[PDB]
């Protein structure tokens, strides 16, 4: 019943003391933190506490949208040699640093996921040519579904896939995705392997990655310019912003101290130094 | 006019949205439907119907009528498999083309129990006892009855009742398995071995066929709708 926006426990006025009770003495061998408050050690007056923990609630701590990835696509001229650039990105929070570390404060989580799409385009070649306002399809390809090989192949029919046709210039795109995990919680860290190396099998056949569950965990997004070739080249950058809503978490873990290296927990050399120089007897 | 503020997402078209929109033919007299026999309400309903499995997919037997026939014989008893099959209904060539798999090919995740049914198709006079077994994953796929017999199985006796059913009980680490080949969501192994042997009297065809069927169970479900690969349009 104690909500987030509740006033914190008050400070009780306590006077001088000379008794056989020892708030001050403990033993951190027990693993337990000694739970004291100012009054326990020094004389205090009465204080009606006003501050609340309101903002520090798990839900509020993740209430911000965050850039997960930057997908780049383009629409070149018809005569061109290179193909029209259409991107495919494996949906994961671990491509960027910020949001990841925040999510790493715990062992597991559940959250309905909100994605936002900020598209931004421009020309590239020195020319005064023209491009009419461009549209963009963002097709979510769940694991196993046919990944588009061309920018104009059958896959874009999306008879079952959930897509979003964004018209450039209008407000950023947004879609809601519930907790879609195969487990009873999303796993930030997975101490194990997908395969088991059997003895009646060759090492190769039984080998897999350390820390990985399913290579394809959530699927890929596919983004393409819908409008056809235009004599003047136009490149586009779609920025995805994720805001984890309705979030729950379990078992806290120490926050990442050294820079990330790969999708794993691994650390690169040359970054193994986080704390600076400070003399013990210097304030 | 009522003061409003446009929010993120406006003007965007979700292929999976569910909004109201204007009608092209206002006041259209719709013809009433009639009681057309056999109405379906859910895809799973079709999944629970038994469908014949193209087991033997050899280059010479694939894409033909021979694929569904698993031929047994009166050869002396051995411990070597008649048929092996991996539980990955939507990704194993054999299962992936049965009703179950097809429906499964439209979803990302599947869960529940499955049941295989084997139909003997020999002469009345032919007898025998076979063993169909489902071994959960995480170990060596059996190659001898000795191992297979250590898992989940049914010992089937061929007789007046021609069909036997072995249920594959939903035993998995995750609440839902991927509809694609994946180690993390692996399914295990389905195997069939001769319990005794096939015995036939004189003047009797010494070899015959068995037909396999598969179907989901009342507890089975599928989620996260997706596009299938079992079809395409080249240009």
């Amino acid at each position, epitope marked *: 019943a104690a909500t987030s926006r509740d006033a914190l426990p008050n400070t009780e006025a306590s006077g001088p003391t000379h008794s056989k009770e020892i708030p001050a003495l403990t033993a951190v061998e027990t693993g337990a933190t000694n739970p004291l408050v100012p009054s326990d050690t020094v004389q205090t007056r009465h204080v009606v506490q006003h501050r609340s923990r309101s903002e520090s609630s798990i839900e509020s701590f993740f209430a911000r949208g965050a850039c997960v990835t930057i997908m780049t696509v383009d629409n070149p001229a018809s005569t061109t040699n290179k*193909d029209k*650039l*259409f*991107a*495919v*990105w*494996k949906i994961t929070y671990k491509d960027t640093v910020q949001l990841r570390r925040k999510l790493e404060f715990f062992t597991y989580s559940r959250f309905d996921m909100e994605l936002t799409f900020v598209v931004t385009a421009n020309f590239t070649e020195t020319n005064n040519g023209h491009a009419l306002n461009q549209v963009y399809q963002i097709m979510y390809v769940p694991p196993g579904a046919p*990944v588009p090989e061309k*920018w104009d192949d059958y896959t874009w029919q999306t008879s079952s896939n959930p897509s979003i046709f964004y018209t450039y210039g209008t407000a950023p795109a947004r879609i809601s995705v519930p907790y879609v995990g195969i487990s009873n919680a999303y796993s930030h860290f997975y101490d194990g392997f*997908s*395969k088991v190396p059997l003895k009646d099998q*060759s*090492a*190769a*056949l039984g*080998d*897999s*990655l350390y820390g*990985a569950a*399913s*290579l*394809n965990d959530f699927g*890929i997004l596919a983004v393409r310019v819908v409008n056809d070739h235009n004599p003047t080249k136009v490149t586009s950058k779609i920025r995805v912003y994720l805001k984890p809503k309705h979030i729950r978490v379990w078992c806290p873990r120490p926050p990442r101290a050294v820079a990330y290296y*790969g*999708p*794993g927990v691994d650390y690169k050399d040359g970054t193994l130094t986080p704390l600076s120089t400070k003399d013990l007897t210097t304030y | 006019g009522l003061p409003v503020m446009n929010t993120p997402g406006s003007n965007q078209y979700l292929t999976a949205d569910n909004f109201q929109s204007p009608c092209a033919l206002p006041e259209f007299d719709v013809t009433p439907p009639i009681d057309i026999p056999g109405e379906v309400k859910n895809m799973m309903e079709l999944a629970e119907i038994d469908t014949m499995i193209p087991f033997d997919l050899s*280059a010479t037997k694939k894409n033909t009528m021979e694929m569904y026939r698993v031929r047994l014989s009166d050869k002396p008893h051995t411990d070597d498999p008649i048929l092996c099959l991996s539980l990955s209904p939507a990704s194993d060539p054999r299962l992936s083309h049965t009703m179950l798999g097809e429906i499964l090919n439209y979803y990302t995740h599947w869960a529940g129990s499955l049941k295989f049914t084997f139909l003997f198709c020999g002469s009345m006079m032919a007898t025998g006892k076979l063993l169909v077994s489902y071994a959960p994953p995480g170990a060596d796929p059996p190659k001898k009855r000795k191992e297979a017999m250590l898992g989940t199985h049914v010992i089937w006796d061929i007789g007046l009742q021609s069909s036997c059913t072995m249920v594959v009980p939903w035993i998995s680490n995750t609440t839902y398995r991927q509809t694609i*080949d*994946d*180690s993390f969501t692996e399914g295990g192994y389905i195997s069939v071995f001769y319990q005794t042997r096939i015995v036939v009297p004189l003047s009797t065809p010494r070899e015959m066929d068995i037909l396999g069927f598969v179907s989901a169970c009342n507890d089975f479900s599928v989620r996260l709708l997706r596009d299938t690969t079992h079809i395409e349009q080249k240009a």
Partner: nanobody, 120 residues
């Protein structure tokens, strides 16, 4: 648009050697593996060999052991399959399956493949 395009041909005499290459693009998130697969004329698709992300740690298939060599050049973003001692069993199509992996089985990107023929 992770474009995987094989090259290397396939029309050698029995016993020779070929260099099977594969141009990779798009976004190959290094970490994982990069490999080779063969379908054969009339058999099931079979795993040939897999090499680690950037690491030159690899394995080979029992059938091909030592007679095939799979490396990489992540500077050139390519993988190579040198094949010495080609034989009548090696006659087949080869595919550069280099994406995700994590092992020697999982994929989200394949190539168009190329045929090899060891004649004699």
């Amino acid at each position: 648009q992770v474009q995987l395009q094989e090259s290397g041909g396939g029309s050698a005499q029995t016993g020779g050697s070929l260099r099977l290459s594969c141009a990779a693009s798009g976004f190959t998130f290094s970490h994982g593996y990069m490999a080779w697969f063969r379908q054969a004329p009339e058999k099931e698709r079979e795993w040939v060999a897999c090499v680690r992300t950037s690491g030159v740690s690899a394995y080979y298939a029992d059938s091909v052991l030592g007679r095939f060599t799979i490396s990489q050049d992540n500077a050139k973003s390519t993988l190579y399959l040198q094949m010495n001692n080609l034989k009548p069993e090696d006659t087949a199509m080869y595919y550069c399956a280099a994406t995700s992996i994590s092992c020697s089985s999982g994929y989200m990107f394949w190539g168009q493949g190329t045929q090899v023929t060891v004649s004699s």
